[PDB]
Symmetry: C3
Subunit: 118 residues, 3 copies
Amino acid sequence: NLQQFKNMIQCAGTRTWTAYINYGCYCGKGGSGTPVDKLDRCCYTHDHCYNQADSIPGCNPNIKTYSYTCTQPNITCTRTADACAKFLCDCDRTAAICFASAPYNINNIMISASNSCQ
Amino acid sequence: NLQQFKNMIQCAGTRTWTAYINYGCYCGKGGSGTPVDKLDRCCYTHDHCYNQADSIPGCNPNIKTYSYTCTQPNITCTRTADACAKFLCDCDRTAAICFASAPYNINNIMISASNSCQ
Amino acid sequence: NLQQFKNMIQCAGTRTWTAYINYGCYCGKGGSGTPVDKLDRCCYTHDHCYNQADSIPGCNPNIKTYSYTCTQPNITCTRTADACAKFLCDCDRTAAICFASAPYNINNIMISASNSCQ
């Protein structure tokens, strides 16, 4: 669930989800070219993870509500039996954590239409 | 199995399992508050891993014996078919390795009853 | 399969597959003793991964063709339904990445018959 992903982002990081709305070539809806940096790389992975989520029966990355807990700054995906829930929570936990450890290059905000994402 | 987690600890790390019995808010039985450091986080994760293991048919974190090998300092989980054995060996390997890479803040030994695990 | 692992290496790293053909105690066929360094550990792990892959029905590490994409330097395993394909692509992607982040100690090329791999 996207609303759970948004909360996981501020759980694990200092920056919120809005910070990543327009970053690099892959953070946001869509992606072209090669990821410009580690952060963009994070979004690249998460992006493929969601894509893959569809391959799971009754699994929609945006709809699916899973189980998780946040112990600022720790995220725990508690689902075991529900494979779709488990898979999806992992994608998001991965991204949130990746987003936090990665540096934020403001130099790479709004480069989408540049020769950077060709 | 717990005796296996113990050996994994000294396999991958320098410090033995006794070193962690009294660390931070989550190393050892129970756990409350925010983990104080990376090591305590390691214990926090491992702790939730065991809890998640119960959700596996015929799976008890303490008595379940799996297959693993130690080529000090390397740990290899051999189980593939046995989902419980596999899951558990992984929990432990994750922790044993995490413990090894994590710094040991002696300042964080015996703080469980302090305002830090509040 | 092996041709896909070879290409994954060039994808994720600077050095190609031939670079590791003769490295440490585990890179290349066989392997005995303690991995001498980070990179060697990589091969050690990957090697155990291929071994474990045989425990999957209709799964041969060298023959199995999986689905993956490379966006230098990024690798994505796209398999979800095909457990064997998925497992194997992971082994390789893991190795390719481990190989790229690990330092290359030319001092550890051709030491297989020395006292170091005992």
